Structure 1
Amino acid sequence: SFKGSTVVELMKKEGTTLGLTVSGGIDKDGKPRVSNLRQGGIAARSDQLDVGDYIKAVNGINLAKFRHDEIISLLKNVGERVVLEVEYELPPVSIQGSSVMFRTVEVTLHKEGNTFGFVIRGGAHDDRNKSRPVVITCVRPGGPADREGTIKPGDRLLSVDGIRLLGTTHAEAMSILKQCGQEATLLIEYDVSV
């Protein structure tokens, strides 16, 4: 399958874990993968990670040739800055059909912990095999997007304060959301039956 990739930076706190559960390794059935994200943890609250994501590398160290326990030792001994290179299954492209119509709605949200409480996946890419609309794949319960109640997994992010996301990469779309201010109006596209 064609994969999307993304870089996630997590700041580790002196007396705590990341709330990130990792499965896999050369001695295991699967490759290194996010298998759980602890509720309210650093990893969950980043809004950049999802269960099922593959971890290709931590701090520029490729994980694939490590045994499971070696990957864990690596993660437990990282300093405050953890840099995960992540690969993920691309979001399916929703297409307008006879029974599916697209509509839009403006959603205003305020930040909390510098995030809007949703994960985006996809984005423009030179390799058209990897190129996708920017899809909101997860909405963290209790977070801003969840509280406001409009945005749903599968919805597309079209613009952020009138800045349109067409042609923008995943990294670019993330920066637009980061360099956003504490409030933002987002344009959301979604599926309607018939």
Structure 2
Amino acid sequence: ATCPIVPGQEMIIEISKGRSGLGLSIVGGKDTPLNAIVIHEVYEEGAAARDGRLWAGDQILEVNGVDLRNSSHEEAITALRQTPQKVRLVVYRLEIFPVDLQKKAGRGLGLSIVGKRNGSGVFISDIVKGGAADLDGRLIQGDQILSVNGEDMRNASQETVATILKCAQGLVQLEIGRLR
């Protein structure tokens, strides 16, 4: 037990996972264009939520002295699972750009829509492999759908954005917010 969380420096903190789950949610990796492992929401049931110091935008750089600079997204989640009951971490403290997509024959956009467990917004969950969104390749898991064809979805429901995206017919102009 040495220090509290302060921005600007490569901090080194330790969390006690104990019997509860760590409860982090990750975005990015070497497989993605983001090229960083970034915390996206802290699940309230988890241990880091108990700990209190990790906020929802913190960049993870190593777990148990395992450098994540080359770790893919899947590699980074297992790195979270392989932690003992104690946890060793090193952390640091949106990008907005447009993506237009054309709906494929039968499926549609080929992406999943969900909301944060605690917090407003609506984000991309899963990208169907042969999907229309996959072959475009610019979207990744955790990307926020800011608007759809101009209309701002920032404080919209999951039913709202689901309904708009499903019923849209031709080319779908999306704004996307991503962490940094």
Sort the TM-score into its range (normalised by shorter chain): 0.3 to 0.5
* Bigger fraction of residues in strand: 1
Normalising by structure 2, what TM-score? 0.45
What TM-score does the superposition give when structure 1 sets the normalisation length?
Answer: 0.42
